[PDB]
C-alpha cells in the first residue's frame, strides 16, 4: 500500500557500484548536486570541461579554428549572455543546488588534478551559470531516436504500471552521452540516465514514480527570409532599419597567441539575422527564450509525490520539446507531446518549417501554448501509451484523439516508420505482461519490411534469367524474416531496402498500397513495380558481394560491437525496416565489419511494485575518461540481452559498493 520507507542518510558519501554507477547520499540537497558534480567530473571530466568551455562561448579562444563556428553561432544568438541572466532569474534555493553541482566539479578537478586533460584546465573553474548556459544550448540550440512505453495495472500479470526508457542517440557525440546515476537525500530518492554536464536527470524513477522522453520535433523556432533593402529591411510596406551591436571574441592561434576578432549582430523585430552561402538573408526567431526554469521543472518533475504535482510541473511549459512519458505506483499512466509551440493562425507545419515571410507582422507570432492545447492521453482505454518518433497519432491504441483536434502547425501526419508500427503492436496484441516478457517484447527485431515486400518480390525474382539473382530469392525465401547474429539473408535484404525505400529506409513510393492512418500497421504495403524491384535486388547482389565479400556473410560476423578490446556479435538493426530494438550499422570497413553509429544506449524496465524491480544496460558504459575500466564493460553484456539489476534500496547498494568518496559540503 505505501512505499517502502526512505532510507535517510546521516552523511554525505558517493558509493560506487562495480560498473561505475555513483549512488550519491546527501544530507540535504545541495549536498547530493556537490557530489553528483564530483561524480559526473571523476566519470566525464574533460568532456563536460570542454563542453562547458564551449556554452561559455569560448570554444574559439579555448581551443582555435575547430571551435569558431559554434562560437559565432551561440554569440549570435545570445546563449551565454542569457545564461547568466537564467541564473538570476533561478528560485534561490535551485540557484543553491547549481552552485553545489559546480561546486562538485571544481572540488574534483582540485583533489585529483592528474584526471583532467591538460587542453581543458583553463575552463575551471566553472559556475552554476556555465551549467545553466550548456543546459540551453542542448535544448534551444541543438534527427535522434528513441522509443518509450508505459502501461497500465489492468494490461498487467501483477497490477503494477511498467515503464521503458530506450533513447537511441550517438555512440560518439559527446554532449549525447548519457550517464547513470543515483540521488538519494532525506526527501528525495532519483535513480536514472541524463546526458553529461546535466545536473538533473532525465530519464529518471525511483520508488513512486518515473518518465521517459523520444524527440518530437517541436518546431520550437521560425526561420524568416528578409527582403533586404536600402540598408535595411522591408516590414509592413515600410523599411526598417536593422537593430547593431558590436560584439568580439577571441580566437586562439597555432602558436598559442589570441588574436581579437569582431562580430556584427544584426537584428530584426524576429531575432538575430544570419546570411547564408546563396545571399538569402535570414532571421532566426526561438520560442521559448524567456522559459529560465528548464532544469528546475525536470527536477519537480521527477521529485514529484503524486500525479497531479506532476502534471502542474510540466504545465510550467519551460521544457521546450519532447514527447514525455509517465507512471507510477498509484497506477497512473500518461503521454504528453510537449514543448514550446508557438499561436499561429495560419499555415500547417511544412510552412512553419520552411522560410517564413520576414516582411510582415501577418507572421510574428508573440505567445505560446498552454500544455492542454498539446496531445496528451492518460490512462487509455488500450491501457498502454507508447512513442517511437512516430507523429502523435496513434500514442494509445484504440486512439483517444485524431489529427483534426489540433492545429496543422503542431506534428506532421506523415506515415509511421515500421519501429513505431512494431511498437504499437507489441503494446496491444499483448496481455497479462510480466516485466519479464515486457523485456522479452523490447529485444524485438523484426524485419517488418521484408514482411511487406518479400511475398510479391521473391516470385518476381525467381522468374528473372540469371541464376543468381535466383539463388538471392531463394536465400530470402528461406530467411525467417529477424534479425538475428546468424541471419545469412539479413545483409543482402538491407542492401535490397536501400535502393527500394532509399539509404535511409523510409521512402514511400515503391510500394503498392500507400500508408493510410485507417490501417497504422499494416500499411504500407506490397510491390508497386515488380520488375524494378527484381533490377534493384539484381544491384543489391553486387553491392553485397562488393560490401561484404558474399550474399551470404552471417549478420553478426559483419555487425559487430566493438568497445576497447572487447569484440561481440551484433544482432537487432535499422528502425525504418521495422527493428524496435535498434542498432544503425555503419558503413562496413575494407573487410566488411560494421559497428553502431547510434542506437540502444540507455535501456532500463521498471516496474512500479513495492519495492519497484528495475533492469538496465548501457551500451558504452559509464565513463569515457581515458584509463577507465568503465567504457567497455556493458557491451558484451549488452550482445547477450543480460540486464543488471538497477539498485535503488540502501542494502543493495552496500552489498554491491566497490568504492566509496566520503565527501564534505
Ligand atoms: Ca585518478
Known sequence: QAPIAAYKPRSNEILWDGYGVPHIYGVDAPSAFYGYGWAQARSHGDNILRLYGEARGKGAEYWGPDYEQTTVWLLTNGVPERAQQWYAQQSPDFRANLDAFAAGINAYAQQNPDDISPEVRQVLPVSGADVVAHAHRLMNFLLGEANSWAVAPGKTANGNALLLQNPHLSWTTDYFTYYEAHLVTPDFEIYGATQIGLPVIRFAFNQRMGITNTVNGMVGATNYRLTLQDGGYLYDGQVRPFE???????????????????????????????????????????????????????????????????????????????????????????????????????????????????????????????????????????????????????????????????????????????????????????????????????????????????????????????????????????????????????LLFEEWARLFAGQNFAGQAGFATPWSLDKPVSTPYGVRDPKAAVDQLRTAIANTKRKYGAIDRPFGDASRMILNDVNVPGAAGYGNLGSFRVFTWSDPDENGVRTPVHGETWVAMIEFSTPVRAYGLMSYGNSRQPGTTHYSDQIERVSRADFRELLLRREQVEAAVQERTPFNF
Open 244 to 490: 547593431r551591436r558590436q560584439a568580439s571574441y577571441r580566437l586562439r592561434q597555432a602558436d598559442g597567441t589570441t588574436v581579437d576578432k569582431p562580430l556584427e549582430i544584426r537584428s530584426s523585430v524576429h531575432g538575430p539575422v544570419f546570411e547564408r552561402a546563396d545571399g538569402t538573408a535570414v532571421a532566426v526567431r526561438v520560442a521559448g527564450l524567456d522559459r529560465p526554469g528548464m532544469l528546475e521543472q525536470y527536477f519537480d518533475m521527477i521529485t514529484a509525490d503524486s500525479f497531479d504535482d506532476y502534471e502542474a510541473a510540466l504545465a510550467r511549459m519551460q521544457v521546450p520539446t519532447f514527447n514525455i512519458v509517465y507512471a507510477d505506483r498509484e497506477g497512473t499512466i500518461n503521454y504528453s507531446f510537449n514543448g514550446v509551440a508557438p499561436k499561429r493562425a495560419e499555415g500547417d507545419i511544412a510552412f512553419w518549417q520552411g522560410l517564413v515571410p520576414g516582411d510582415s507582422s501577418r507572421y510574428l507570432w508573440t505567445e505560446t501554448h498552454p500544455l492542454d492545447d498539446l496531445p496528451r492521453v492518460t490512462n487509455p482505454p488500450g491501457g498502454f501509451v507508447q512513442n517511437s518518433n512516430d507523429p502523435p497519432w496513434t500514442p494509445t491504441w484504440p486512439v483517444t484523439y485524431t489529427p483534426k483536434d489540433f492545429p496543422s502547425y503542431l506534428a506532421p501526419q506523415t506515415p509511421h516508420s515500421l519501429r513505431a508500427q512494431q511498437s504499437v503492436r507489441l503494446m496491444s496484441e499483448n496481455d497479462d505482461l510480466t516485466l519479464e516478457r515486457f523485456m522479452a517484447l523490447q529485444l524485438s527485431h523484426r524485419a517488418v519490411m521484408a514482411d511487406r515486400t518479400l511475398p510479391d518480390l521473391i516470385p518476381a525474382a525467381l522468374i528473372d534469367p540469371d541464376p543468381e539473382v535466383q539463388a538471392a530469392a531463394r536465400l530470402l525465401a528461406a530467411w525467417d524474416r529477424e534479425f538475428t547474429s546468424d541471419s545469412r539473408a539479413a
